[PDB]
Amino acid sequence: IDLEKSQQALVQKRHYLFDVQRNNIAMALEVTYRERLHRVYKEIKNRLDYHI
Amino acid sequence: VQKLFVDKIREYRTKRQTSGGPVDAGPEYQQDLDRELFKLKQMYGKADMNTFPNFTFEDPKFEAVEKPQS
């Protein structure tokens, strides 16, 4: 009994953490694209603030 | 007091007629605000008048490791 569940324990463990590695890198590209759209507004706000 | 009032309006229009700019300032107001803005632009930032900024960024290299199980 204890070695039958030892089969099934590693097949629910592995598919959870192999999609966490999908989504831990998925957030790494959104927060570097959201900060790409935001920064290009910041360095054109400096010229909208300087000449006044 | 209206006759005193239009006497003020006369001297504002002779102050409008300018050809050399600051007549009473001289070098005192010219050396001040040129040094005042450059002391403030040093606190503001080194940005050009028409150079639009453009750049790129490098994301982290998503590496992997090994772990022998089953």
Automatic annotation (TrEMBL), chain A:
What this protein is reported to do is described as: Subunit b, of the mitochondrial membrane ATP synthase complex (F(1)F(0) ATP synthase or Complex V) that produces ATP from ADP in the presence of a proton gradient across the membrane which is generated by electron transport complexes of the respiratory chain. ATP synthase complex consist of a soluble F(1) head domain - the catalytic core - and a membrane F(1) domain - the membrane proton channel. These two domains are linked by a central stalk rotating inside the F(1) region and a stationary peripheral stalk.
The uppermost taxa in this organism's lineage are: Eukaryota, Metazoa, Chordata, Craniata, Vertebrata
> What family does the Swiss-Prot or TrEMBL record give for this protein?
Belongs to the eukaryotic ATPase B chain family.
Subcellular localization is given as: Mitochondrion; Mitochondrion inner membrane
Q: How does it assemble?
A: F-type ATPases have 2 components, CF(1) - the catalytic core - and CF(0) - the membrane proton channel. CF(1) and CF(0) have multiple subunits. Component of the ATP synthase complex composed at least of ATP5F1A/subunit alpha, ATP5F1B/subunit beta, ATP5MC1/subunit c (homooctomer), MT-ATP6/subunit a, MT-ATP8/subunit 8, ATP5ME/subunit e, ATP5MF/subunit f, ATP5MG/subunit g, ATP5MK/subunit k, ATP5MJ/subunit j, ATP5F1C/subunit gamma, ATP5F1D/subunit delta, ATP5F1E/subunit epsilon, ATP5PF/subunit F6, ATP5PB/subunit b, ATP5PD/subunit d, ATP5PO/subunit OSCP.
Name this protein carries in UniProt: ATP synthase subunit b
Q: Which residues of the complete protein does this chain represent?
A: 150 to 201 of 256
